[PDB]
Amino acid sequence: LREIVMTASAAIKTPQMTLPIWNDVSDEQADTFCKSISKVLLSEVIDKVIVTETT
DNA sequence: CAAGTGTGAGGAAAAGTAGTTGGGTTTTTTTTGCAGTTGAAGACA
Numbered sequence: 001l002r003e004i005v006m007t008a009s010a011a012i013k014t015p016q017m018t019l020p021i022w023n024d025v026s027d028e029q030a031d032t033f034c035k036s037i038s039k040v041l042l043s044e045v046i047d048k049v050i051v052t053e054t055t
Numbered sequence: 056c057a058a059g060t061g062t063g064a065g066g067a068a069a070a071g072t073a074g075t076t077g078g079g080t081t082t083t084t085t086t087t088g089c090a091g092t093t094g095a096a097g098a099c100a
Binding site: 009 | 090
């Protein structure tokens with residue numbers, strides 16, 4: 001309530017956007033779209049990093 | 056052997072006052088949350 005009324009902050013702490021999905025949109029299509037929009041960082045795919053510094 | 060004028064000081068004491076000190080206040084003139092904002096360096100056409 002403070003984040004709205006008191007500060008009218010243009011930076012919500014947890015900004016969310018709700019998306020209605022068409023009646024025709026399957027649940028499986030919906031999970032595909034959920035994957036399709038979410039961000040994927042390069043870190044998120046790395047398993048191990050080995051640096052062999054030789055000098 | 057003796058009696059008789061003139062007279063200077065020595066002495067005492069309670070309270071005060073000295074010396075030496077101190078006390079004594081008096082009197083005294085280690086960010087722990089927040090959101091915003093400016094100015095800055097840097098950068099651009």
